[PDB]
Amino acid sequence: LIDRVEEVREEMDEAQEAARFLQQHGSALTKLEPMVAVLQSDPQQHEQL
Amino acid sequence: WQSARELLRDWPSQRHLADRVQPLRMRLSELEQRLNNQQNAERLLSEFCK
Amino acid sequence: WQSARELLRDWPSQRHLADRVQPLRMRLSELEQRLNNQQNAERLLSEFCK
Hints:
The structure is cut from a larger assembly and holds 3 copies of chain A.
Chain A (H helix, E strand, L loop, with lengths): L4 H28 L10 H6 L1
């Protein structure tokens, strides 16, 4: 009565959704990852800084 | 900034677990075939019991 | 810096995959019993067919 097929199916749902998101926003995340730090500095906040 | 940090935190996990879909796919195919066999065995057991 | 970035890229994968240990342990046990039954059946077949 393992009934793990439901658990494995949930894992598939999560993992296929992850793959779909990778396809959807893979390029955007790759372009964001090398210059993420900029988000911490907002132009006017640079003067207030 | 915080949203981007969280997104870059999750994204490697997403990439890490995406490849497991296909290994998971055969896993559930085998598991469900096993469950079909288990259901058949249970049905046949009950069938003879009487 | 590059090594640090690589290490913190590993850390997401490291924890996520390390979480997989125990489910794989039962899978290994099941597969071991499968192999044992395989050898048992093969042996019995050989002795009969002799």
